[PDB]
Amino acid sequence: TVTEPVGSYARAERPQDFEGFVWRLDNDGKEALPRNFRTSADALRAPEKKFHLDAAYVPSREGMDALHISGSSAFTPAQLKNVAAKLREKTAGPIYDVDLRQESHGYLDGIPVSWYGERDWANLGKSQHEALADERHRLHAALHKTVYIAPLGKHKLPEGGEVRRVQKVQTEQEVAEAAGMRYFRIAATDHVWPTPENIDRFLAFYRTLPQDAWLHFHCEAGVGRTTAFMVMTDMLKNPSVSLKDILYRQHEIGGFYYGEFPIKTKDKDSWKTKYYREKIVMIEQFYRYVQENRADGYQTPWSVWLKSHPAKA
Amino acid sequence: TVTEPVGSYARAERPQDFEGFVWRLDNDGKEALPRNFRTSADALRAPEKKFHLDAAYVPSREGMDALHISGSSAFTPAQLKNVAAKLREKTAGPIYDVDLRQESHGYLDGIPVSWYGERDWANLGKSQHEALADERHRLHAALHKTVYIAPLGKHKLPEGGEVRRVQKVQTEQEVAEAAGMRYFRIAATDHVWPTPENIDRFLAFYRTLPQDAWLHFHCEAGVGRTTAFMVMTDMLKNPSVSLKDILYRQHEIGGFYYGEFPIKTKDKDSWKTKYYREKIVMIEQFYRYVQENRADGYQTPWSVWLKSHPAKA
């Protein structure tokens, strides 16, 4: 009897110890584009030293021209419009804003904010239905009320910021539509491998996309969640490409590197270590799922297949 | 107390361990031109992936139209005539066959051959006078004798070939003069940075050239020595062009890339690694010599300046 299988370690954490406490500023809006903006059309750059990769290695670009995906961190409405314009120069198909954030977030007076709890786990353990209900209620409750919006500084705690009486509230779905993008939400918890529920939902969505759909994935800050789904999409769409090439190329266009590397954390972030190790194991298991299930058109869902073929630490 | 300074690493190798053992076929004469033929008038191509350069970078072509240089690997007499005809269409000045090969080579019954030792180091350690004496003696000794001429295969050892009784012997100087080209020899060792003597000789020669001289450099196989001297010439003649532009453009017309890149060799070629690193450092040092000594007309030669301004690994 195993309480939590590999790929589900976060289920052991207690949601009540990470409840939200502040409206975090997701982007100050000073730049034209959100941070970490990158597309599959981009040239590959040298790998980051931290990953101890082979800088001489030349990854195959097989399928990258037709992949049609991009990623970025959070954005203001104006930044999303800039992203949409850039992507429209690359395709005539529908462009999707694939929101990978489980945390409740939205726009107050056009300012992108999120209800932040320790480790960005304010919605940990909630079903997507529950997470979205929390978001809807919180955003609506902010209208015509005074709120404190702040960036996180020293030790992931509020520092500075501003206080305002909100006159307009918008969901990301509304902002996406205003930018001419379709919207699709996958409520994935920050810092951990996406759940079987998250991936099942993504795969079902992937299956009904028109051939020319362009997927723009985004998370809050960094490249963890976006890279996981960009890697999964690359594997699904280009199954003949080696795991090494997929992992190297998604890292070299600006994402995270999801293969083995010497994990090193500050004491303050030692809790992240097992989650990084879990992600490495799970990306390999997903690759196995794609290889073993593509032939019959993925008749067996990832969640079902993973229960019969559990990953090992 | 340093035994061998940077730029002179090859002096630590033992010549007795690389003595010549076969007449290597330098070109089978099946094509109209030698391999790697390129001129400074050529359009720039995308960079080779192994150098991990910026494919979007467009180097300045400032001065290329007036540079008047070309390079190629070894050739048969007929191929050299083809090259000479092609170059004559581009200039009315003297066209020089600048022979950069230290290894003894010539033509037996019109077949281009070289006396090959491991690493193509059969003349390593010999002064230019001694290398040329060896060449003359070896070529003459072949007349009216049976010789084995072969291309190198797998582990850089003879494979196939032919056996013939030689009825005619010619030096490259004779073949060049028959193609209508002037001849100049610089005995440079294959695979390593040219010696201070090699470079002093080239610069003294460069200073004697009329304005409209065209220099055709050639080596044995590949683009190592030819690119080194083409880069030196470009730096001398176009001193206002950035180091980056010189290196990118000489690579992009078909030569080697002499800037920093992630060096990767097959296990059997690992001995080459430090010589590649040495070349990178020395190219920068030569650029410094040009920048520091052009203003006064090079009153101090490279060898002297290099001893007072040694390069650092």
- Give the domain ranges of chain B: 1-28+103-170, 29-102+171-313
For B84-121, give the secondary structure using H, E and C.
HHHHHCCCCCCEEEEEEECCCEEEECCEEEEEECHHHC
Length of chain A equals: 313
Class for domain B1-28+103-170, per CATH?
Answer: alpha beta
Selecting from B56, B262, B263 the residue whose C-beta is nearest the C-beta of A43 gives: B56
Resolution (angstroms) stands at 1.7
| Chain A residues lying within 8 Å of B277, measured CB to CB | none
CB contact at 8 A, A257 and A48: yes
**CA distance, residue A58 to nearest chain B CA (Å):** 7
- Quote the DSSP letter at residue A164: E
β-strand pairing of B69-72 with B214-218: parallel
DSSP of chain B, one letter per residue?
--SS-TT-GGGGS-GGGG---EEEES----SSS-TT-EETTSPP-PPPGGG---TT-----TTHHHH-EEEES---HHHHHHHHHHHHTT-SS-EEEEEEE-S-EEEETTEEEEEE-GGG-TTTT--HHHHHHHHHHHHHHHTTSEEEEE-B-TTS-B-S-EEEE---EE-HHHHHHHTT-EEEEEEEPTTSPPPHHHHHHHHHHHHH--TT-EEEEE-SSSSHHHHHHHHHHHHHH-TTS-HHHHHHHHHHTTS---S-------GGGGGGHHHHHHHHHHHHHHHHHHHHHTTTT--S-HHHHHHHS----
- Other CB atoms within 10 Å distance of the CB of residue A4: 11
* Tokens of residue B296, six digits: 């006064």
Chain B nearest-CA distance from A263, in A, is 24
Q: Do B55 and A46 touch (CB under 8 A)?
A: no
Provide the strand spans (E) within chain A: 20-25, 38-39, 69-72, 95-101, 105-108, 111-117, 146-150, 162-165, 169-170, 182-188, 214-218
CB pairs under 8 A between A and B: 17
Residue A43 and residue B55: Cβ atoms within 8 Å? yes
Calculate how close chain B gets to A54, using CA atoms only, in Å. 9
What are the beta bridge partners of residue A150?
A24
Angle at B290 between CA B231 and CA B71, to 5 degrees: 15
Residue A298: which region, alpha, beta or left (left: phi > 0; alpha: psi -120 to 50)?
left
A286: how many CB neighbours lie within 10 A of its CB?
Answer: 24
**Separation of alpha carbons A54 and A52, rounded Å:** 7
Q: Strand pairing partners for B57?
A: none
For B115, residues 6+ apart whose C-beta sits below 8 A from its C-beta are B20, B22, B23, B24, B103, B104, B105, B122, B134, B135, B138
The residues near B101 (Cβ < 8 Å, ≥ 6 apart) are B114, B185, B187, B188, B190, B218, B219, B220, B225
Contact A122, A242 (CB under 8 A): no
| Residue that is written with structure tokens 């800039």 in the block | A82
Among the listed residues A76, A125, A77, the one whose alpha carbon sits nearest the alpha carbon of residue A102? A125
Q: What order of strands is seen across the sheet that includes strand B105-108?
A: B162-165, B146-150, B22-25, B111-116, B105-108, B169-170
Q: Nearest to residue B84, comparing CAs of B181, B219, B158?
A: B181
The number of residues in chain B equals: 313
Residue identified by tokens 């470079």 is B199
Q: Which of B55, B56, B263 sits opposite A56 (nearest CB)?
A: B263
| A43 touches B: beta carbon within 8 Å | yes
Residue B152 burial class via C-beta count within 10 angstroms: exposed 0-12, middle 13-18, buried 19 and up = middle
* 8 A C-beta contact, residue B58 and residue B175: no
Render the burial of B16-31: b for 16+ CB within 10 Å, e for the rest: eebebebbbbbbebee
CATH topology (fold) of A29-102+171-313: Protein-Tyrosine Phosphatase; Chain A (3.90.190)
